[PDB]
Amino acid sequence: VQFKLVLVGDGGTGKTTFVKRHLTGEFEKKYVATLGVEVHPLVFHTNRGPIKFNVWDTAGQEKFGGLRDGYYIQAQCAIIMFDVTSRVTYKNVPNWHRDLVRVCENIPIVLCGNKVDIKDRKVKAKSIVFHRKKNLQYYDISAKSNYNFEKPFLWLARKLIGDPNLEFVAMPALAPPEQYEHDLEVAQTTALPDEDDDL
Amino acid sequence: GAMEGILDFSNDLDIALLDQVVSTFYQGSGVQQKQAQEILTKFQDNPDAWQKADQILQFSTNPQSKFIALSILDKLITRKWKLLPNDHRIGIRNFVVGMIISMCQDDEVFKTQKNLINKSDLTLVQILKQEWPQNWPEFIPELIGSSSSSVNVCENNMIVLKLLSEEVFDFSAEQMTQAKALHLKNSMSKEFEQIFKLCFQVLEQGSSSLIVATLESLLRYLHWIPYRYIYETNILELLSTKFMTSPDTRAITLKCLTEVSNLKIPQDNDLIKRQTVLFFQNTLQQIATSVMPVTADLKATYANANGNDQSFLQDLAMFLTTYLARNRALLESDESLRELLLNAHQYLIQLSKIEERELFKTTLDYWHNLVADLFYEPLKKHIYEEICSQLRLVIIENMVRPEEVLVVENDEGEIVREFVKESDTIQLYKSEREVLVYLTHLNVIDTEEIMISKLARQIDGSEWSWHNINTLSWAIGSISGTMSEDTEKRFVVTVIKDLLDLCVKKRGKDNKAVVASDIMYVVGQYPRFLKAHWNFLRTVILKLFEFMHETHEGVQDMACDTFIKIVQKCKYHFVIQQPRESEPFIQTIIRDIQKTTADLQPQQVHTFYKACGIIISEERSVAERNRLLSDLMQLPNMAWDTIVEQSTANPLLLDSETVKIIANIIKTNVAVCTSMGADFYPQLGHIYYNMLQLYRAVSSMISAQVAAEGLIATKTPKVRGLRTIKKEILKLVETYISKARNLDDVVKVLVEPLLNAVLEDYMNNVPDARDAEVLNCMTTVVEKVGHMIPQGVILILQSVFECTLDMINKDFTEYPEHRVEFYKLLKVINEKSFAAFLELPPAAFKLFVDAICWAFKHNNRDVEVNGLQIALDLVKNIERMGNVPFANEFHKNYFFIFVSETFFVLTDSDHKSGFSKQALLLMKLISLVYDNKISVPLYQAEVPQGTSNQVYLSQYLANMLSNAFPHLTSEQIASFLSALTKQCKDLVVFKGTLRDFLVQIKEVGGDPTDYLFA
Amino acid sequence: EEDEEVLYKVRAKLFRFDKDAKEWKERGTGDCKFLKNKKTNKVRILMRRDKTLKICANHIIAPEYTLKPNVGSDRSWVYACTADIAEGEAEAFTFAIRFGSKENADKFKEEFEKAQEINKK
Ligand SMILES: *[C@H](CC(=O)O)C[C@@H](O)/C=C/C(C)=C\[C@H](C)C/C(C)=C/C=C/[C@@H](O)[C@H]1C[C@@H](O)[C@H](C)[C@H](/C=C/C)O1
Ligand SMILES: Nc1nc2c(ncn2[C@@H]2O[C@H](COP(=O)(O)OP(=O)(O)NP(=O)(O)O)[C@@H](O)[C@H]2O)c(=O)[nH]1
Ligand SMILES: [Cl-]
Ligand SMILES: [Cl-]
Ligand SMILES: [Cl-]
Ligand SMILES: [Mg+2]
């Protein structure tokens, strides 16, 4: 049915932005620091049925850390996030992993290097090796471009359900049913974001 | 509500209510969970909450409540331990120790509350970090003794010891001063003989959960212990035999053995070499007999993902690669060891067939290590000839799609243009290519035979698939350079004959797309061949031109990329007149450029034009080259001329079609300028005057639009289109100037009209209408000719400095491009034309200092780094002036501003990325005073007259730190500053001292003698 | 969706307007299809996100809807939807939908309006 997922990593690495993208489809440009933790349910439809992740999106800023490792209690899986444009965030990966596995001794964990859409990459592909001895899955991702955005959830689902051929599927779409002026005019006259994007 | 009651410390703690709040948080959902979370965080953060810890541990029925109690204690121990009265310290130690003992002796608790016991153990370790051994000398002997009284206690003691080793050896560098880390490492080292004794005895006397815990501890010890503990005892036999047999112990044993393989070990000792061979031999024998034979299909096993098979196969890969990279020479000379060597490598071959990208990278790294060694070390390659032959097959069959191959199969089985770049396979391709290149050199006959026969089975249809032709084609392309020119010739001819057959035989847009992409990849990969076979090269190019009319957008785009890829390498053959041709091929291309590019998108047209510029720059005779350039630019120059008439008569608002035409003309110029560089000048000069006039006209259009429609006008397709014209004009000028060789013309002809056209327009537009590209263009201008235009640089500063600063000094995020370009501009001005800043009025020079410090405070690396560099360069610029009034006043006004601002970002924990450059700057500043390089007093009789700046500096800093960090003792501050000032000529030591200060400010009672570390 | 004919398909990015914040928020990128029900002849928009395949638009192309320009774009339409069920219970939204090109946006409008006539039959 459902699994507790903890999401950890340095402040500003894109944890919340990544979750939001999955929740609503949106890309939040602003950086509003998470305070302690935010819990969101997130459901995926698979060939093996629905899987629900209760996502505990934790604060990466030390000053907003709240219960810190207290959030990890009974997690069944995890994502460790860093930012490929910020070397300090990769340097801190072993610290996050240390704190996490001290509480969660045998869970599937994905390591994600976020923000690969940014041209000036700083954490070189070749350098990313921490996951190997720790048996973490690794993916380059971008919450902004959606590059590999589904990969961490697909992998975790396969591990959790115990089926390596599990796939996301389209669920059948139910037949839909059969001041306006002012609200529309406001929407018409607020520019769409990123008009230089391919889509 | 009810839950907030635990926050009222004036009343007794209702433990039941606490357990309800905790349960609501962990087991609840929605608003109630959210409220409960905030309450617990507030409770946790209460600086007296630790006083409740004992009560919670005693009375709670909720293990998560007790975890939280322990987190509360952890925070107290790590940050405020030495603030506590001595009886609170003794009491806390007693109840943590007691809780642990109590939980271990109850089998039910020990079995079911592992998380809580691990948390308790970690909390005990935090107390050890503070108290041990100086105020707890018998901890280890008593731990060892207590281990005999209970299997539970003994197992838990192994957990405690594992955590201590980690905290001391693996995670101390960031968390402890250099001196304290040394103390704890020395202390653990001195008692390790007895820790090991206990470890080895448990391991000898075989309880599985206890054994696993002991082995987990051993894994940590292996990070630092001397090798004699491993080689002078019987522990290697146990690890490589006994503990490999049971699956529960096998996982950890294998990781231990991997670390054993990394021990520091004498190189000249035959007995030790024998031992290193023996454990490997033992381990491989266990794998073969107890896990799987070398023939086993590990690909299949991994894909099944039963139990812990995936992690085990990963750890096996790590073990084999680690050992063999270090030790395979031990196995290479002795005939009796050959079978082991090859079986080990055969397992690796099997592991390399697993479908798991990251695991493949690990094994590929090993193969690279091997083949690079075989390439050089005499008499070795023959040993591995069969391994290498199998490896050739593996790599060829798993070649990732090259960056150049733009077509991919969609989920519906259609061959389509990729939506985006596969950015995460770039490194993978390079690594695969690297290994395959070595393998080709090692046996060119085998490689050719493999490729030519695989290709033959695509053609005859026996093995045909998109996947198969693709991996093969990519492989064939990737080995370009390995064969002799002569051997390559025959090989390429054979491959192309076959691929052309395949192209005739496999029809439909999908097949045609796949095969076209593969042939384009291959031909683009063999320029040496193209250069030697003009008739073939000409035929390839004409075929590419055909594809420029393809309705398949992926093929079409790839044709353009391949054209330029080929031209970049073969351009010389396009500029000469080839035997049996009437004209150089460049003439043929240019003559028919309208037809060839008719179906291309504008950006593809620009690429085509860019490729033509590459060719034309091969012509070194100026007359002939300028003629070719003129011919190339004929179409855009004719379109330009007609637009310059339609502007000359008007100016009114350009329609969107005209705006697009103009943008594309300029983009075409940019493209050609990019490849021709300094050679582009005659074309630039041809359009320049009218181009700057057009810049002004479009500028007035933009302004008029913002005036009539509001700021929202800047979002419209029309205004965005007009700004594109301005941006491309700026890009064209920047591109040219960045490559110009005639700087006299740049200054005399280009600069004055540019500045006249761009500067006032930037200054006098509203913020949202200002192009950051103006700043970028000016940076190149200053970089290339700044030394020659001192008044020009002044004008640039006057025009953009204050107004841009005001855009970016309200927060860290608005106008991100302006922000980044702004600081690049100031950097180059400070570097090349410092006199420009000397000329500023004092009020403006103050804004400059403010701007630099503002840069410091960014977390944005693109701003922070430049800010620090400017600060450093500025200090050097001032110092270079010597004892003159400007420098004296500079120091009087700003020395302490730079010192304190630098200290601030060093110490606030929000600018850790800039540590190295902050330290550098601080060291420079301190060394200025330490070297008496500041001529005037930095103080005003605020101190005795004649007081040295050294003395005043210490006083200022001690006061500054005393007020900013009141929890530090005066001696801590005094000792820190003494060390720091003494060390201002030795950056590595100076930084160590800064790092020690950063540790000490996070706690109370840090030892001042720590700053004596050396 | 086997009881449905695909009248039209196009790659698109869908936005929804958050009134409270004054901003457009992306809802999904993927194939926007116009589907005609073979039993009822009614034409809906159905759009699914790439990769996750999650529904980001599911609504009838009501005859009363009108496609309007967005001030920032020549390749987008904005319109009010009274009943979208992508997320579950029917809900009103102001949508914007952007395409790879103006040509695509103009084709979409043409097809959108054809679909509206069908829904009037
Ligand atoms: C599909 C079939 C076709 O012939 O069009 C091919 C299509 O998918 C793409 C072809 C591409 C991108 C390049 C071709 C290699 C260009 C051609 C057709 C070159 C032909 C050259 C012949 O003169 C060639 C025949 C062979 O005997 C060899 C290669 C000789 C070389 C002599 C030095 O010449
Ligand atoms: N360029 C780019 N920016 C991204 C990406 N993902 C997130 N961001 C940006 O990075 C910033 C921080 O994102 P956020 O999700 O708040 O980070 P966080 O890891 O949750 N921070 P905290 O741990 O403090 O709550 C935001 O401005 C966001 O838009 C990405 O993939 N690419
Ligand atoms: Cl617990
Ligand atoms: Cl050449
Ligand atoms: Cl003191
Ligand atoms: Mg966050």
Side-chain angles (χ1 to χ4, degrees), chain A, chain B residues 1-646 649 651 654-1014, chain C:
Chain A
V1 55
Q2 78 204 319
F3 303 89
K4 181 173 169 173
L5 186 153
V6 296
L7 173 57
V8 305
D10 279 6
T13 51
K15 299 188 298 301
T16 295
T17 302
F18 177 74
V19 172
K20 272 196 204 166
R21 174 69 95 184
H22 274 282
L23 286 174
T24 70
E26 85 193 82
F27 183 75
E28 178 55 73
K29 293 169 180 279
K30 298 186 300 307
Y31 177 19
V32 176
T34 298
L35 302 175
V37 71
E38 278 189 46
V39 178
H40 283 107
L42 175 62
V43 186
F44 289 92
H45 296 114
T46 83
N47 53 9
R48 301 298 312 273
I51 183 175
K52 186 193 223 161
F53 292 93
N54 294 130
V55 176
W56 289 42
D57 173 24
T58 70
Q61 300 291 345
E62 197 189 310
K63 69 177 155 290
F64 302 131
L67 309 179
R68 310 185 295 172
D69 51 310
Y71 299 133
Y72 314 156
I73 293 168
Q74 287 164 5
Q76 290 156 307
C77 60
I79 298 168
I80 304 179
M81 196 78 75
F82 70 96
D83 175 353
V84 305
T85 72
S86 174
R87 299 173 61 71
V88 62
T89 75
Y90 182 68
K91 178 188 81 47
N92 286 321
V93 163
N95 297 328
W96 289 111
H97 177 267
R98 170 201 61 213
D99 299 342
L100 175 62
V101 306
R102 281 167 173 185
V103 176
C104 308
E105 291 186 297
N106 189 33
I107 56 160
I109 305 169
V110 193
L111 181 62
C112 301
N114 196 29
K115 311 203 189 181
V116 303
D117 58 285
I118 298 178
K119 190 208 166 78
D120 198 0
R121 187 176 170 148
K122 298 289 172 50
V123 180
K124 283 168 39 59
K126 218 159 169 37
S127 306
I128 302 171
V129 303
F130 178 74
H131 58 288
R132 305 169 162 184
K133 287 188 174 186
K134 304 309 183 177
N135 310 109
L136 321 177
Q137 182 54 276
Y138 177 72
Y139 302 108
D140 274 3
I141 75 166
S142 177
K144 185 162 181 235
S145 78
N146 297 299
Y147 192 80
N148 284 339
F149 87 118
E150 84 287 3
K151 294 301 205 321
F153 287 104
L154 180 60
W155 184 77
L156 285 173
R158 289 171 167 172
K159 298 292 270 183
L160 289 163
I161 296 318
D163 181 355
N165 303 303
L166 178 155
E167 300 279 12
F168 296 136
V169 301
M171 290 304 273
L174 279 22
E178 297 275 39
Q179 199 81 314
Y180 152 91
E181 202 88 73
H182 178 64
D183 303 344
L184 191 58
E185 211 272 339
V186 177
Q188 280 179 72
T189 60
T190 307
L192 297 177
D194 315 308
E195 192 64 32
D196 286 331
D197 283 353
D198 280 340
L199 270 179
Chain B
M3 294 196 298
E4 315 205 82
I6 71 171
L7 299 192
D8 191 347
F9 275 50
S10 81
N11 302 309
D12 304 351
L13 174 55
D14 181 351
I15 295 295
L17 182 57
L18 177 73
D19 292 344
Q20 193 196 38
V21 176
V22 171
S23 296
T24 298
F25 174 57
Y26 288 96
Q27 273 77 48
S29 65
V31 181
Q32 286 302 307
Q33 184 178 48
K34 178 175 196 173
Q35 288 181 335
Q37 200 275 140
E38 279 144 25
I39 290 164
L40 292 171
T41 290
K42 279 180 207 178
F43 178 91
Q44 185 196 240
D45 296 342
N46 192 307
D48 293 316
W50 69 267
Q51 301 199 242
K52 313 301 179 176
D54 199 9
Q55 184 192 356
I56 293 164
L57 294 176
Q58 288 179 44
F59 289 98
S60 183
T61 71
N62 187 326
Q64 284 74 62
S65 288
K66 299 194 197 158
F67 189 108
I68 288 169
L70 287 170
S71 297
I72 290 164
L73 285 175
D74 180 279
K75 180 145 57 161
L76 176 77
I77 297 158
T78 57
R79 307 200 67 193
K80 295 184 173 180
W81 188 244
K82 308 203 177 69
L83 202 54
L84 296 164
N86 195 68
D87 64 355
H88 292 137
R89 280 192 291 267
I90 286 172
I92 287 165
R93 182 206 295 202
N94 287 346
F95 81 72
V96 177
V97 171
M99 182 197 173
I100 290 172
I101 287 167
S102 163
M103 283 191 84
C104 290
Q105 289 175 350
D106 179 322
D107 297 323
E108 190 59 27
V109 176
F110 185 71
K111 192 188 88 183
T112 61
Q113 304 304 347
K114 293 303 193 196
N115 275 348
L116 185 54
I117 297 178
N118 293 343
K119 183 57 162 178
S120 306
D121 289 347
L122 186 54
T123 308
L124 170 59
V125 171
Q126 300 283 14
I127 297 175
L128 297 168
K129 282 155 77 185
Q130 300 285 344
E131 295 284 300
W132 173 86
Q134 67 275 355
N135 196 23
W136 202 342
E138 302 319 306
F139 176 71
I140 290 298
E142 286 179 351
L143 180 147
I144 286 170
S146 69
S147 292
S148 62
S149 72
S150 167
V151 164
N152 288 2
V153 168
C154 186
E155 176 179 326
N156 188 247
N157 286 333
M158 303 298 185
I159 292 168
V160 172
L161 290 172
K162 175 192 76 180
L163 292 172
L164 186 64
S165 190
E166 294 184 342
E167 294 293 290
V168 174
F169 288 97
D170 308 317
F171 302 111
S172 60
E174 299 162 29
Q175 299 177 4
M176 288 184 204
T177 61
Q178 294 172 101
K180 186 174 187 205
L182 182 59
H183 171 67
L184 288 177
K185 291 182 185 170
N186 280 342
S187 300
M188 265 201 89
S189 186
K190 288 164 187 155
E191 295 203 72
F192 187 73
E193 196 71 64
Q194 298 301 298
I195 294 171
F196 182 81
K197 198 167 181 291
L198 168 68
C199 181
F200 185 79
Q201 283 170 20
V202 172
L203 294 187
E204 263 198 333
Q205 300 157 199
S207 163
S208 209
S209 73
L210 168 58
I211 292 289
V212 174
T214 309
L215 291 171
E216 286 285 347
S217 80
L218 179 64
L219 176 61
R220 276 69 169 185
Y221 302 153
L222 288 164
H223 302 177
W224 65 268
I225 65 177
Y227 88 93
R228 62 184 166 85
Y229 284 105
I230 306 309
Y231 278 70
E232 293 178 1
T233 63
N234 198 45
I235 201 173
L236 285 175
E237 166 179 289
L238 295 188
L239 292 178
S240 64
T241 61
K242 183 179 167 193
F243 298 133
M244 285 297 298
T245 62
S246 33
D248 45 21
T249 64
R250 179 188 298 155
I252 183 61
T253 315
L254 199 50
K255 293 146 72 157
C256 284
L257 288 173
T258 298
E259 293 321 308
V260 161
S261 302
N262 293 320
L263 278 174
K264 186 154 63 56
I265 282 175
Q267 294 299 281
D268 49 21
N269 179 347
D270 292 330
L271 176 43
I272 284 180
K273 287 179 180 183
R274 260 180 284 287
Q275 289 172 274
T276 301
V277 172
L278 187 56
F279 85 77
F280 195 69
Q281 184 180 94
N282 283 338
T283 303
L284 273 284
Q285 169 59 356
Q286 293 302 313
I287 296 301
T289 69
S290 290
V291 192
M292 74 295 183
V294 201
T295 54
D297 185 348
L298 306 187
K299 178 186 176 66
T301 303
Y302 199 96
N304 292 343
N306 295 329
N308 297 306
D309 287 2
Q310 287 190 353
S311 289
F312 168 78
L313 290 169
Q314 290 168 24
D315 296 345
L316 185 57
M318 184 62 61
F319 171 64
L320 297 170
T321 58
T322 298
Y323 182 100
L324 289 169
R326 186 140 183 236
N327 291 315
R328 67 184 173 243
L330 299 181
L331 312 177
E332 284 169 351
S333 290
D334 180 342
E335 266 177 4
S336 71
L337 298 180
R338 183 59 55 89
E339 184 178 314
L340 176 59
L341 175 69
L342 295 179
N343 281 328
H345 283 90
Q346 189 63 36
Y347 276 121
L348 278 176
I349 287 285
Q350 295 301 89
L351 289 159
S352 305
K353 292 164 181 181
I354 295 180
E355 188 180 4
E356 181 74 275
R357 279 271 165 86
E358 291 306 308
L359 179 53
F360 191 74
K361 288 173 190 181
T362 300
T363 56
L364 190 61
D365 277 344
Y366 176 80
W367 293 126
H368 179 234
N369 177 286
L370 178 59
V371 295
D373 199 351
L374 302 187
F375 181 79
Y376 269 111
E377 188 70 30
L379 312 185
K380 298 300 179 161
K381 69 176 170 175
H382 79 277
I383 299 169
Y384 299 92
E385 258 154 32
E386 164 64 11
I387 293 307
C388 287
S389 194
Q390 293 180 77
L391 188 58
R392 284 182 192 99
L393 288 182
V394 167
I395 305 301
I396 288 166
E397 292 179 13
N398 196 217
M399 290 300 290
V400 70
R401 184 164 53 95
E403 77 191 33
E404 295 95 329
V405 175
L406 306 184
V407 303
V408 71
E409 190 188 334
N410 72 17
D411 285 323
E412 292 57 51
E414 317 177 282
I415 301 294
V416 306
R417 184 186 195 180
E418 58 185 13
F419 287 161
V420 295
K421 299 313 302 170
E422 208 81 341
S423 57
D424 80 350
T425 60
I426 289 301
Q427 180 63 67
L428 182 52
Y429 171 77
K430 287 169 188 170
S431 299
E432 293 181 321
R433 177 183 70 200
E434 188 167 53
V435 172
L436 192 60
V437 164
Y438 276 120
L439 282 166
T440 304
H441 183 96
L442 293 167
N443 200 311
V444 66
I445 287 167
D446 191 37
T447 306
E448 185 177 333
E449 280 174 355
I450 292 170
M451 293 177 172
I452 287 309
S453 64
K454 278 185 161 283
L455 190 47
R457 295 191 297 266
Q458 292 299 285
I459 278 50
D460 76 13
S462 58
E463 301 190 317
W464 166 256
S465 70
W466 291 338
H467 172 279
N468 288 351
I469 194 53
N470 280 354
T471 205
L472 183 60
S473 294
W474 306 340
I476 291 165
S478 79
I479 65 161
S480 184
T482 57
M483 298 171 173
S484 68
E485 179 151 9
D486 215 39
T487 309
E488 176 180 270
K489 194 267 207 278
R490 273 167 258 118
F491 179 67
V492 166
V493 168
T494 300
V495 168
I496 294 297
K497 277 177 183 178
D498 269 26
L499 288 176
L500 288 173
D501 278 23
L502 227 294
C503 171
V504 174
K505 279 134 52 60
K506 295 288 170 194
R507 289 189 221 72
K509 79 156 189 288
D510 292 324
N511 274 346
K512 298 283 209 200
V514 166
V515 174
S517 68
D518 286 337
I519 296 180
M520 283 194 282
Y521 180 69
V522 168
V523 300
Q525 277 294 110
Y526 286 93
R528 178 172 69 185
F529 185 86
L530 302 178
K531 286 195 221 181
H533 300 90
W534 169 249
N535 286 326
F536 180 79
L537 169 53
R538 184 199 73 216
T539 313
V540 169
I541 299 304
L542 291 170
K543 195 59 171 198
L544 296 182
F545 290 180
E546 277 201 338
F547 290 166
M548 291 174 188
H549 307 288
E550 255 286 346
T551 57
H552 196 296
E553 295 189 332
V555 174
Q556 183 180 51
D557 199 34
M558 186 162 182
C560 295
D561 293 341
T562 300
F563 174 49
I564 197 165
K565 177 170 185 191
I566 286 171
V567 162
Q568 281 168 340
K569 297 302 190 285
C570 303
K571 66 268 199 195
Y572 178 69
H573 294 268
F574 293 82
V575 85
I576 67 181
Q577 187 166 336
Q578 296 277 353
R580 302 169 48 95
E581 308 284 345
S582 68
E583 56 190 1
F585 202 65
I586 187 60
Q587 179 166 294
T588 307
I589 294 174
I590 292 173
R591 272 161 189 237
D592 229 19
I593 204 157
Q594 184 148 41
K595 275 196 162 70
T596 309
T597 65
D599 302 309
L600 292 186
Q601 297 306 299
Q603 78 178 334
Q604 292 163 329
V605 182
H606 311 148
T607 297
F608 192 103
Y609 273 76
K610 181 164 72 191
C612 291
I614 300 181
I615 298 166
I616 290 177
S617 280
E618 292 294 294
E619 175 53 73
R620 298 327 302 162
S621 189
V622 63
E624 293 80 346
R625 186 180 60 246
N626 289 350
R627 184 43 128 105
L628 287 168
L629 177 49
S630 171
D631 291 346
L632 178 62
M633 300 306 289
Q634 176 168 321
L635 293 179
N637 278 342
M638 288 175 86
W640 180 250
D641 290 346
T642 84
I643 287 173
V644 172
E645 287 165 55
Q646 298 170 352
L654 301 173
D655 68 356
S656 62
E657 203 75 304
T658 300
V659 164
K660 291 165 187 304
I661 287 172
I662 292 184
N664 281 331
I665 287 162
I666 303 296
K667 284 171 178 295
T668 303
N669 282 262
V670 176
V672 176
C673 188
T674 302
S675 58
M676 297 192 60
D679 299 341
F680 192 75
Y681 186 76
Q683 174 56 25
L684 184 57
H686 177 68
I687 66 174
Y688 196 63
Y689 173 84
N690 282 329
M691 174 180 79
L692 293 183
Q693 290 300 111
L694 174 70
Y695 190 97
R696 293 162 182 277
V698 167
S699 290
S700 297
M701 292 173 201
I702 294 159
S703 300
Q705 214 66 4
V706 169
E709 301 189 344
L711 290 185
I712 198 55
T714 68
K715 296 296 199 290
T716 64
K718 182 60 102 311
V719 169
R720 291 188 289 106
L722 294 164
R723 291 178 84 171
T724 291
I725 295 174
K726 290 176 76 172
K727 296 185 283 178
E728 295 293 332
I729 290 170
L730 292 161
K731 182 173 181 193
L732 176 60
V733 179
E734 191 281 325
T735 300
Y736 179 67
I737 293 181
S738 74
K739 303 177 195 284
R741 297 181 65 85
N742 194 327
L743 303 184
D744 285 345
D745 284 356
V746 173
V747 173
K748 191 237 270 277
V749 183
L750 301 188
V751 170
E752 197 182 332
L754 180 65
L755 298 191
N756 281 355
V758 306
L759 291 184
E760 191 174 339
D761 168 78
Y762 180 99
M763 192 180 69
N764 294 339
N765 248 348
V766 296
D768 283 1
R770 286 176 185 144
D771 303 301
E773 293 77 6
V774 169
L775 302 173
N776 180 83
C777 191
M778 296 305 100
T779 303
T780 296
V781 170
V782 172
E783 172 65 57
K784 301 297 160 178
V785 298
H787 62 288
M788 309 168 73
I789 57 153
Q791 289 307 310
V793 177
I794 285 162
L795 194 63
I796 290 165
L797 263 189
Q798 290 171 346
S799 299
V800 313
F801 171 59
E802 286 186 65
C803 65
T804 304
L805 181 55
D806 195 68
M807 290 169 70
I808 67 164
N809 72 356
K810 283 128 190 63
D811 59 46
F812 294 104
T813 59
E814 193 171 24
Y815 301 111
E817 283 73 47
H818 293 75
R819 206 173 280 280
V820 168
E821 302 306 320
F822 180 72
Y823 286 108
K824 279 147 69 173
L825 183 51
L826 297 182
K827 179 160 114 70
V828 69
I829 296 176
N830 191 49
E831 286 171 319
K832 308 288 193 152
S833 187
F834 179 59
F837 290 112
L838 300 177
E839 299 295 301
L840 287 178
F845 189 92
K846 187 229 145 232
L847 292 176
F848 178 47
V849 166
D850 291 344
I852 295 158
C853 295
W854 182 241
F856 283 8
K857 298 194 187 37
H858 287 63
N859 270 124
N860 180 352
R861 293 290 292 163
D862 291 346
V863 172
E864 162 187 77
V865 165
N866 281 335
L868 293 163
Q869 191 60 48
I870 294 160
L872 204 76
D873 292 342
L874 175 55
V875 166
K876 290 165 166 71
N877 286 347
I878 292 295
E879 195 199 342
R880 216 189 307 258
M881 299 177 80
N883 188 2
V884 303
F886 194 90
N888 297 337
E889 290 311 301
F890 170 86
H891 290 121
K892 285 198 325 202
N893 291 322
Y894 303 114
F895 177 84
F896 284 118
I897 285 170
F898 280 110
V899 169
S900 56
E901 289 288 330
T902 305
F903 254 104
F904 178 81
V905 291
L906 269 165
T907 60
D908 76 353
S909 283
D910 292 335
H911 303 76
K912 291 185 193 188
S913 60
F915 180 75
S916 291
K917 284 186 65 161
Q918 294 153 3
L920 189 62
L921 172 58
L922 191 63
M923 208 186 64
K924 180 64 179 193
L925 291 164
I926 290 183
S927 72
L928 283 179
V929 168
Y930 180 103
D931 287 333
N932 269 110
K933 287 281 181 60
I934 297 179
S935 304
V936 292
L938 287 179
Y939 51 86
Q940 53 227 33
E942 107 181 73
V943 100
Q945 285 340 265
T947 301
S948 72
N949 277 328
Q950 282 100 338
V951 166
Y952 183 69
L953 206 220
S954 287
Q955 185 175 310
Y956 176 101
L957 287 177
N959 178 74
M960 185 187 84
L961 297 174
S962 169
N963 289 310
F965 308 99
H967 60 287
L968 298 177
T969 69
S970 306
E971 178 147 329
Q972 274 181 288
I973 295 171
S975 295
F976 164 63
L977 291 171
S978 182
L980 199 72
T981 53
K982 273 169 56 153
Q983 296 166 355
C984 72
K985 304 296 168 50
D986 188 351
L987 180 61
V988 59
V989 174
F990 188 90
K991 289 161 74 175
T993 292
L994 291 180
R995 291 197 194 91
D996 290 338
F997 185 70
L998 301 183
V999 173
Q1000 291 206 348
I1001 66 179
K1002 290 196 269 192
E1003 64 196 50
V1004 179
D1007 191 336
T1009 68
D1010 289 6
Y1011 302 106
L1012 299 180
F1013 178 89
Chain C
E1 311 142 40
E2 293 78 24
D3 292 21
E4 279 176 318
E5 195 195 352
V6 183
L7 303 184
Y8 175 62
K9 190 167 109 294
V10 71
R11 231 204 138 34
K13 181 174 281 164
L14 187 63
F15 296 88
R16 81 198 152 75
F17 190 74
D18 177 327
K19 283 130 172 27
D20 288 339
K22 228 123 230 197
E23 50 178 49
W24 286 105
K25 295 178 162 183
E26 304 178 24
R27 215 192 185 202
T29 290
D31 287 335
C32 180
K33 315 182 195 198
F34 292 7
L35 299 173
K36 185 158 107 110
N37 187 278
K38 279 179 261 199
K39 295 175 167 65
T40 79
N41 297 312
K42 293 285 165 188
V43 187
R44 66 168 165 173
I45 281 172
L46 184 64
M47 183 180 177
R48 293 176 184 278
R49 298 191 187 127
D50 282 341
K51 291 327 202 305
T52 65
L53 300 185
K54 290 186 174 177
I55 299 168
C56 55
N58 185 4
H59 56 266
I60 295 276
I61 308 186
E64 37 276 311
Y65 293 166
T66 314
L67 300 181
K68 303 276 191 181
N70 184 260
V71 72
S73 182
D74 67 352
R75 63 183 175 118
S76 295
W77 301 115
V78 356
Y79 66 105
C81 179
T82 62
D84 182 89
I85 60 171
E87 308 268 290
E89 45 178 348
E91 202 176 333
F93 288 104
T94 308
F95 287 134
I97 186 165
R98 186 162 70 198
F99 312 82
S101 67
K102 178 172 191 306
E103 282 70 20
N104 278 18
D106 293 336
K107 190 61 165 49
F108 176 100
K109 172 159 159 65
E110 192 193 335
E111 295 287 349
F112 187 96
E113 285 171 13
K114 285 183 198 176
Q116 280 175 308
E117 300 297 344
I118 289 170
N119 283 340
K120 271 159 64 172
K121 297 185 210 155

